[PDB]
């Protein structure tokens, strides 16, 4: 069977700016075993979770990261916001599934979990499935920064600082995005 467990059950998830991709190949996938086993979000575009078990694809990608609850809505075709624009962008014609669950009991800490970051500053929007891991000081003026933070010179990433007492819109959510591409078709339902 396809190794979804390694994705969904990873101990640690990536920061959304540095989102992880697992390329799935040459295996059989029960996507109905997923679509009940427990998820606050399970939205499919251009496919149904039921119909996936009688379909074959060249490859499947499993993208995974953490964002805050109120940002899960940006993980959909046609959205704008700091997450869709600067961190993780789905194409308008997306074919796949967005799956999310509250991870407050795994990813929040007393005093703040500062390990999860997002890109706040960027001069232009990401292309679909673009990953920007630049740490370059953001030049907000005409004066070059020369790697030093100061006036008009900003670290481009910010921390969520997840705390267990946060309201649910500010709690961490683990997200997995399944993308299906159509060479010989190597990933099939049973």
């Amino acid at each position: 069977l396809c190794p979804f467990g390694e994705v969904f059950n990873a101990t640690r998830f990536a920061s959304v700016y540095a989102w992880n991709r697992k390329r799935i190949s040459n295996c059989v996938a029960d996507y109905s075993v997923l679509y009940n086993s427990s998820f606050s979000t399970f939205k499919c575009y251009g496919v149904s979770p039921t119909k996936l078990n009688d379909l074959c694809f060249t490859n499947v990608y499993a993208d995974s990261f953490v964002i805050r609850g109120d940002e899960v809505r940006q993980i959909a075709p046609g959205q704008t916001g700091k997450i869709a624009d600067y961190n993780y962008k789905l194409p308008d014609d997306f074919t796949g599934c967005v799956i999310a669950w509250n991870s407050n009991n795994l990813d929040s800490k007393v005093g703040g979990n500062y390990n999860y970051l997002y890109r706040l500053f960027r001069k232009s929007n990401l292309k679909p499935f673009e990953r920007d891991i630049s740490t370059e000081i953001y030049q907000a003026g005409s004066t070059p920064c020369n790697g030093v933070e100061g006036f008009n010179c900003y670290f481009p990433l910010q921390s969520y600082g997840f705390q267990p007492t946060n309201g649910v819109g500010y709690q961490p959510y683990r997200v997995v995005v399944l993308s299906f591409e159509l060479a010989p078709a190597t990933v099939c339902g049973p």
Partner: antibody, heavy 115, light 108 residues
Framework: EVLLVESGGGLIQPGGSLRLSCAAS????????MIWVRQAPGKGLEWVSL???????FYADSVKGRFIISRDSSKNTLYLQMNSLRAEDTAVYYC?????????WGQGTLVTVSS | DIQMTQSPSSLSASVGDRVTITCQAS??????LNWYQQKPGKAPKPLIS???NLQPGVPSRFSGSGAGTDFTLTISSLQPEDIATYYC?????????FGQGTRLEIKR
């Protein structure tokens, strides 16, 4: 030192169009988050519009479909295009480098919507 | 929309008094709350960002605290130059929304 200077405000009839300009010095408009905020005479502050570092735009429901926020990098200027103006749009309009970066507010330009 | 309610709407205090202005959000905004000072006949000036961070050129007699739905601006030693309307603002959840403002008068 950062300067923001709004202009373009004045008397306009209901249904008319105005363009406000906010000329910036000391930072690059096209690289920054900026907003328009308004204040009706003797009232509080109301958010109008937002443009992201990368150009995504957001609007208050009361101005959606009427107002357009934009910027011209060659002139280092932020705009607010205001169409189908109503008496309740009457206000001092402020531009600001907000909500991210070194914060700065302009001095405001007065828009009076009246026949 | 997140409604912001400040308390009180006006106050009058003596020179040297410790003044408290509160701001309640109708839902959680975490730390993402700003304070502004608007002096008679000026534009709003940033005073505090993200609950407690002092802006450039604001004396340390100003401070901010709170979290979630409940926030406080404290002026520790009121001076006549502090005559102003103070506004809270939540910015991290669109639409950006402001409190209705607190008018501050100084006694003599």
């Amino acid at each position: 030192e950062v300067l923001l200077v709004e202009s373009g405000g004045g008397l306009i009839q209901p249904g008319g169009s105005l363009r406000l300009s906010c000329a910036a010095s000391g930072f690059t408009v096209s690289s920054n988050y900026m907003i328009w905020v308004r204040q009706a005479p003797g009232k509080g502050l109301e958010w109008v519009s937002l443009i992201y570092s990368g150009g995504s735009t957001f609007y208050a429901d009361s101005v959606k479909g009427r107002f357009i926020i934009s910027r011209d990098s060659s002139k280092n200027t932020l705009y607010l295009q205001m169409n189908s103006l109503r008496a309740e749009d009457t206000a001092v309009y402020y531009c600001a480098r907000e909500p991210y970066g070194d914060k700065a507010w302009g001095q405001g330009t007065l828009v009076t919507v009246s026949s | 929309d997140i409604q912001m309610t400040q308390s009180p709407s006006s106050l009058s205090a003596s020179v040297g008094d410790r003044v408290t202005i509160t701001c309640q959000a109708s839902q959680d905004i975490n730390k993402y709350l700003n304070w502004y000072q608007q002096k008679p006949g000026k534009a709003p000036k940033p005073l505090i960002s993200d609950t407690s961070n002092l802006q450039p050129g604001v004396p340390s007699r100003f401070s901010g605290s709170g979290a979630g739905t409940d926030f406080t601006l404290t002026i520790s030693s009121l001076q006549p130059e502090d005559i102003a309307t103070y506004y809270c603002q939540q910015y991290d959840n669109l639409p950006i929304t402001f409190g209705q403002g607190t008018r501050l008068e100084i006694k003599r």
